[PDB]
Amino acid sequence: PKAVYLWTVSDVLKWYRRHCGEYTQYEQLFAQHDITGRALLRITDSSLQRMGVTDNRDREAIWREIVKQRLKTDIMEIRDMERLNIY
Amino acid sequence: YINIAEWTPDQVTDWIKGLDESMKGYLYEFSKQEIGGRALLNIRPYELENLGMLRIGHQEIVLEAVENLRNFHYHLKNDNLQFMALHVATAAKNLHRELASTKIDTRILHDITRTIATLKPLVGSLERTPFRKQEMYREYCGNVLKCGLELATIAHRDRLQPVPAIRQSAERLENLANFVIQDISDPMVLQPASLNLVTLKKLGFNIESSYNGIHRVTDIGKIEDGDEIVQINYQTVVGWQHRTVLEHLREALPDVVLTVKKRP
């Protein structure tokens, strides 16, 4: 249950294979650009273009997975803040 | 004086060094191109690339840290609950305008994460002095978190008609933000943040560092729990890693002067 902001580049690559398995050709981009978990939380559609994910369909699919992972992290952080407001 | 815009290139590289070990390869180019405080505060991705920082992961280390540095330098007067609520209201209204069938657009999902992000400084402030131990602010915090969880779980599909449900949550979040802006008369929500120099000659506090490099006193004379440390011996540490802040504090000898942001 390691928080995303602690993810190493290796953790991000393992995440990419799990959720972007139909887009394996862009996996090396995340390694070459040192996309840690901290970087994964700040990537936008624009920075994916700049990285070289030129195909609009490929980029939209990858961008959606990144946003969905942020929502998962958001839910985890909201529950942590909810427990901090009760305790 | 903490005029970051008047930083020399040496002060810029001094600050850049503390962000991450990955920054060490770029200090030479920052100095060579004479990146001062003004250029740092407005630095853009292509300018980082002109400095040879081509790895986007490295760019985002700088850009995230500079965004915190910009907030400390330009908006200290509005570092209060009211303007945190204004940011929440702004993001919620933006999400509402964007919403004006089973699948939620990625853009809408993105707006939800950006909206939820504005909740974090507001909630974080609500859970510190002087709002932490007031029953009304604790209930208010619970309502904000309940609405935020509603937004996130619907977006994650965790919870038929997603767009109308998201629209209702965005309106509720806007109403909750306006509770501070319109309904609360507590002067504390409008108090500007202030800086104080604390000189120590010894020192039993601990430092809790957020993920983004905000360092606050915890587990503790002129220093209270939750106060943010922005400088150690006049070296700005906003955005620095937790490890390098401790290394700088430990090396600071028994005589340490802390620049502390103080709670209302």
Numbering used by the authors:
A (entry chain A): 19 to 105
B (entry chain B): 3 to 102, 108 to 166, 169 to 211, 216 to 233, 243 to 286
Mind quoting what the paper says about this structure?
Given that the CNKSAM–HYPSAM domain interaction is necessary but not sufficient for KSR–MEK recruitment, we sought structural information on CNK beyond the SAM domain using CNK2–330, which minimally comprises the SAM, CRIC and PDZ domains. We determined a 2.1 Å resolution structure of the complex of CNK2–330 with HYP2–106 by single anomalous dispersion phasing using selenomethionine substituted proteins. The CNK–HYP complex adopts a rigid four-lobe torus (or ring) with extensive interactions between all four domains. As expected, the HYPSAM domain interacts with the CNKSAM domain in a prototypical head-to-tail manner with a buried contact surface of 518 Å2 described previously. A buried contact surface of 961 Å2 between HYPSAM and CNKCRIC is composed predominantly of hydrophobic residues on helix α5 of HYPSAM and on helices α2 and α3 of CNKCRIC. The PDZ domain adopts a canonical fold and, despite its C-terminal position within the SAM-CRIC-PDZ sequence, adopts a central position between the CNKSAM and CNKCRIC domains in the toroid structure, making no direct contacts with HYPSAM. Furthermore, none of the inter-domain interactions mediated by the PDZ domain are canonical in nature. A buried contact surface between CNKPDZ and CNKSAM of 667 Å2 comprises a mixture of hydrophobic and hydrophilic interactions. Importantly, this defect, as well as the reduction in pMEK levels, were fully rescued by co-introduction of the D81R mutation, which restores a favorable salt interaction but with opposite polarity. These results support the relevance of the CNKCRIC–CNKPDZ interface and provide further evidence for the validity of the toroid CNKSAM-CRIC-PDZ–HYPSAM crystal structure. Although the D195K, M197E and V198E mutations in CNK did not impair the elution profile of the CNK–HYP complex on their own, they hampered the ability of CNK–HYP to assemble with KSR–MEK. Together, these results identify a conserved surface in the vicinity of the CRIC-PDZ linker of CNK that mediates a direct interaction with KSR–MEK.
In flies, CNK, like KSR, acts at a step between RAS and RAF to facilitate RAF activation, but its precise mechanism of action remains unresolved. Here we show that the fly scaffold proteins CNK and HYP stabilize the KSR–MEK interaction, which in turn enhances RAF–KSR heterodimerization and RAF activation.
